[PDB]
Amino acid sequence: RGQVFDVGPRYTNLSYIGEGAYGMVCSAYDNLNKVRVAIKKISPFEHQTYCQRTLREIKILLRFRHENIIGINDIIRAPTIEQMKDVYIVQDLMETDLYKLLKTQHLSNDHICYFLYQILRGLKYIHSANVLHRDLKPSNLLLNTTCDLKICDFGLARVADPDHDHTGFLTEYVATRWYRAPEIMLNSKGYTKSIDIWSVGCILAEMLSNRPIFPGKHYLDQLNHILGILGSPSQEDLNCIINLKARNYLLSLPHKNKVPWNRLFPNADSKALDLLDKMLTFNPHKRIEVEQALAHPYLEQYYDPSDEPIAEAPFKLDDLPKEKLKELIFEETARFQ
Ligand SMILES: CC(=O)c1ccc(N2CCN(C(=O)CN3CC[C@@H](C(=O)Nc4ccc(O)c(Cl)c4)C3)CC2)cc1
């Protein structure tokens, strides 16, 4: 679109797909490996934050190999650090994403069940590598005509760090508001695996009704949408809240009873709602883990631990200047030259 998309000599015949904060994505013909691929142009080097998100996307996707996780097939950039101003990331081309599908189609239970299984199968692999995605939502679940589902966008991913998850009440957060677990607003930095399970619970709810379950209009409104459905937290859950300010705030609220899942989703499968309840558990310590979710009765037709692979070894940037991050991005993309 009169921007500049220099991907030769391997890729030709471009067509605009979309754009966002990250940059722009087109489809293109891989003249060396038969078919059309997706190529995204990233221009991150003027700011540390954009460099961090780019290095995470690249380092992680290059180390992962899983059917339900988008791969990186190739990376195009200049031959020297001085001339490198953009980076083009080549990935398998997908037809749509769950966000776009839910705007035009109501899904049958058997589609919801199969898509949920794939999300959880990919998430099992991510979590087995000690990685957190931290921004799961419908637009980050890519889909094709044969209903294959691939998780994308690891720009906000982190290595899990439960010992350093604690933070103060109403601490700012970057990931997508509607998919934030309640603890993000109360006492958590989103450094435990439970953060992702909550987001998957939101996605399941959204597949059941074609509407976001907790559409907060702003930061604090997100927690009151969550409490408006889950109802007031139990005494046990309040005494696990850590922060004086978070405890005081929850104790100051009028009592609110839980809205039954069968009243929000009167046409849903009862086993889907039992699993939804366990993913949307207020206390992250009581929230179901990915392996338990895969073993839940709702997914019994697909559950097969021998066909739900894990990573061969776990993964083991904050305040690193943009210049150092550019050098690391250069080194990480060297294998494709
Ligand atoms: C603000 C700013 O300058 C900025 C700069 C960088 C930045 N990063 C975010 C994380 N990165 C990504 O590339 C994430 N991508 C972007 C697009 C999405 C994706 O994978 N789509 C996709 C893939 C295959 C397909 O077949 C199809 Cl149809 C679509 C996730 C790195 C860059 C964020 C922000």
UniProtKB/Swiss-Prot annotation:
GO biological process, one term: positive regulation of telomere maintenance
Protein kinase domain residues: 11-299
Binding positions (ATP): I17, G18, E19, G20, A21, Y22, G23, M24, V25, K40
Described purpose of this protein according to its UniProt entry: Serine/threonine kinase which acts as an essential component of the MAP kinase signal transduction pathway. MAPK1/ERK2 and MAPK3/ERK1 are the 2 MAPKs which play an important role in the MAPK/ERK cascade. They participate also in a signaling cascade initiated by activated KIT and KITLG/SCF. Depending on the cellular context, the MAPK/ERK cascade mediates diverse biological functions such as cell growth, adhesion, survival and differentiation through the regulation of transcription, translation, cytoskeletal rearrangements. Acts as a transcriptional repressor. Binds to a [GC]AAA[GC] consensus sequence. Repress the expression of interferon gamma-induced genes. Seems to bind to the promoter of CCL5, DMP1, IFIH1, IFITM1, IRF7, IRF9, LAMP3, OAS1, OAS2, OAS3 and STAT1. Transcriptional activity is independent of kinase activity.
Residues with PTM Phosphoserine: S15, S232, S234, S270
Modification Phosphothreonine, positions: T171, T176
Tree of life domain: Eukaryota
Annotated PROSITE patterns: MAPK, PROTEIN_KINASE_ATP, PROTEIN_KINASE_DOM, PROTEIN_KINASE_ST
Gene Ontology molecular function: ATP binding; double-stranded DNA binding; identical protein binding; kinase activity; MAP kinase activity; mitogen-activated protein kinase kinase kinase binding; phosphatase binding; phosphotyrosine residue binding
Modified residues (Phosphotyrosine): Y173
Catalytic activity: L-seryl-[protein] + ATP = O-phospho-L-seryl-[protein] + ADP + H(+); L-threonyl-[protein] + ATP = O-phospho-L-threonyl-[protein] + ADP + H(+)
GO CC annotations, alphabetized: axon; caveola; centrosome; cytoplasm; cytoskeleton; cytosol; dendrite cytoplasm; early endosome
The name this protein goes by in its record: Mitogen-activated protein kinase 1
Localization (cell): Cytoplasm, Cytoskeleton, Spindle; Nucleus; Cytoplasm, Cytoskeleton, Microtubule organizing center, Centrosome; Cytoplasm
Residue positions of motif TXY: 171-173
Family note: Belongs to the protein kinase superfamily. CMGC Ser/Thr protein kinase family. MAP kinase subfamily.
Organism: Rattus norvegicus (Rat)
Domain notes: The TXY motif contains the threonine and tyrosine residues whose phosphorylation activates the MAP kinases.
Gene3D superfamilies found in the cross-reference section: Phosphorylase Kinase, domain 1, Transferase(Phosphotransferase) domain 1
Gene giving rise to this polypeptide: Mapk1
Cofactor: Mg(2+)
Primary localisation category: cytoplasm
Enzyme class, spelled out: transferase
Known EC number: 2.7.11.24
Complex formation: Binds both upstream activators and downstream substrates in multimolecular complexes. Interacts with ADAM15, ARHGEF2, DAPK1 (via death domain), HSF4, IER3, IPO7, MKNK2, MORG1, NISCH, PEA15, SGK1, and isoform 1 of NEK2. Interacts (via phosphorylated form) with TPR (via C-terminal region and phosphorylated form); the interaction requires dimerization of MAPK1/ERK2 and increases following EGF stimulation. Interacts with MAP2K1. Interacts with DUSP6. Interacts with ARRB2.
Active site: D135
Protein keywords: Acetylation, Apoptosis, ATP-binding, Cell cycle, Cell junction, Cytoplasm, Cytoskeleton, Kinase, Membrane, Nucleotide-binding, Nucleus, Phosphoprotein, Serine/threonine-protein kinase, Transferase, Ubl conjugation
